[PDB]
């Protein structure tokens, strides 16, 4: 069902990091997105049920957990938790550009769903040893995002320039937090422009910012 969101109907998805004591990192941002999308897309969504599955999935958790929450249009929901494996602090992810392009007019790109054909295809273009993450651009050659991350580029001034939403990408939760804190700013740029970035990162709510290098 999660693996066949392209031929069949799709599900809404949220991937979060649960932490001892403080629970899900950026929890309210995740629920805001999930509840907002369910409302816009016509998904039955019972918050009491969402809280139930999350509470059961995290019952007895002793350390950080990667938690995947999924919602089907009929209101059916699942939550899965497994130990979070953080990246070493000195780890730098290698990025490559997929030939797979996104369509800026595809409105479904602003919802995190199981309809991941484009991203799965982009990811299949490169081996793990060739790219830790694969970036996708749109019909105007503007970088949008990674298959599972948003992009943040520092062209020298300390501001994390991240692709503007109208380029065709997921408004990520980490992305949103960085924008609201004044740390990131919307911008437009190509793969080639990134070569002039003094610092580069890709990130998501689960892992935070990940230093990256373009190839
Ligand atoms: Cl938050
Ligand atoms: Cl729909
Ligand atoms: Cl942690
Ligand atoms: Cl932060
Ligand atoms: Cl702009």
From TrEMBL:
Q: What is its EC number?
A: 2.6.1.42
Molecular function terms from GO: branched-chain-amino-acid transaminase activity
Keyword list (alphabetical) reads: Amino-acid biosynthesis, Branched-chain amino acid biosynthesis, Pyridoxal phosphate
Q: Name one GO biological process term.
A: branched-chain amino acid biosynthetic process
Whether Disulfide bond counts among this entry's keywords is no
Annotated Pfam families? Aminotran_4 (PF01063)
What is the phylogenetic placement of the source species in the record? Bacteria, Pseudomonadati, Pseudomonadota, Alphaproteobacteria, Hyphomicrobiales
Tell me the pathway. Amino-acid biosynthesis; L-leucine biosynthesis; L-leucine from 3-methyl-2-oxobutanoate: step 4/4; Amino-acid biosynthesis; L-isoleucine biosynthesis; L-isoleucine from 2-oxobutanoate: step 4/4; Amino-acid biosynthesis; L-valine biosynthesis; L-valine from pyruvate: step 4/4
Gene3D superfamilies, A to Z: 3.30.470.10, D-amino Acid Aminotransferase, subunit A, domain 2 (3.20.10.10)
- Which family is annotated? Belongs to the class-IV pyridoxal-phosphate-dependent aminotransferase family.
Family matches, as InterPro entries: Aminotrans_IV, Aminotrans_IV_CS, Aminotransferase-like, BCAT-like_C, BCAT-like_N, Class-IV_PLP-Dep_Aminotrnsfr
The reaction(s) catalysed by this protein are:
L-valine + 2-oxoglutarate = 3-methyl-2-oxobutanoate + L-glutamate; L-isoleucine + 2-oxoglutarate = (S)-3-methyl-2-oxopentanoate + L-glutamate; L-leucine + 2-oxoglutarate = 4-methyl-2-oxopentanoate + L-glutamate
Supply the enzyme class, top level: transferase
Tell me what this protein is called. Probable branched-chain-amino-acid aminotransferase
Which cofactors must be present for this protein to function?
pyridoxal 5'-phosphate
State its role.
Answer: Acts on leucine, isoleucine and valine.
């Amino acid at each position: 069902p999660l693996r066949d969101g392209d031929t069949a109907d799709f599900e809404l998805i949220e991937t979060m990091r649960w932490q001892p004591g403080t629970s899900f990192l950026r929890f309210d941002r995740h629920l805001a997105r999930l509840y907002g999308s369910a409302a816009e897309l016509g998904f039955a969504c019972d918050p009491q049920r969402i809280a139930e599955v999350l509470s059961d999935a995290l019952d007895g958790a002793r350390t950080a957990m990667r938690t995947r929450l999924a919602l089907a249009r009929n209101g059916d929901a699942t939550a899965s938790a497994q130990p979070y494996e953080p990246l070493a602090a000195d780890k730098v992810w290698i990025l490559r550009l997929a030939r797979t392009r996104l369509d800026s007019q595809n409105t479904l790109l602003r919802h995190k769903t199981s309809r991941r054909q484009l991203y799965t295809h982009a990811r299949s273009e490169y081996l793990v040893t060739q790219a830790d993450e694969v970036l996708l651009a749109n019909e105007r050659g503007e970088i949008c995002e990674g298959t599972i991350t948003n992009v943040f580029a520092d062209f020298g001034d300390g501001v994390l320039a991240t692709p503007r939403l109208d380029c065709g990408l997921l408004p990520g939760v980490l992305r949103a937090e960085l924008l609201d804190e004044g740390r990131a700013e919307e911008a437009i740029y190509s793969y080639d422009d990134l070569k002039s970035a003094k610092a580069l990162f890709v990130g998501n709510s689960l892992r935070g910012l990940i230093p990256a290098k373009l190839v």
